[PDB]
Backbone:
């Protein structure tokens, strides 16, 4: 009787970032995986 | 008797970002996977 | 008897972004997978 | 007896973005997969 | 009888960032995995 009010059984996120670029300037309040 | 009020059994997200570009300037309040 | 009020059994999202472009400037409030 | 009030059994989204273009400037409030 | 009010059974996130780019300057309030 799991009887659970709010459940998330699984989540799976895969992020790849690659930046060749140079001389690029940015402002980010938060980047969990950010690349400049 | 799982009896669960709110459930998400699975989620699966895959993001690929590659940036050749240079001299690009951006402002992002938040980027979970952002590339400048 | 799963008896579940709100369920999402699966979700599957795959995003590919590649940017050759240079000298491009943008403002994004949020980008989960954004590329500048 | 699944007996579930609101269910989504599956979703599957695949997005490919490639940008050759340079010197392009945009403002996006949110881009889940956006490319500048 | 798990009987649990709020549960997340699993989460799995994999982020890869590689930056070839030089002479790039950014301000990030927080970067959990950020690359300059």
Residues:
């Amino acid at each position: 009787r799991h009887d659970s009010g709010y459940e998330v059984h699984h989540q799976k996120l895969v992020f790849f970032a690659e930046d060749v670029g140079s001389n690029k300037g940015a402002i980010i309040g938060l980047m969990v995986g950010g690349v400049v």
The interface with chain D takes residues 1-36 of chain C (CB under 8 Å). Residues 15 and 32 of chain C are 10 Å apart (CA to CA).
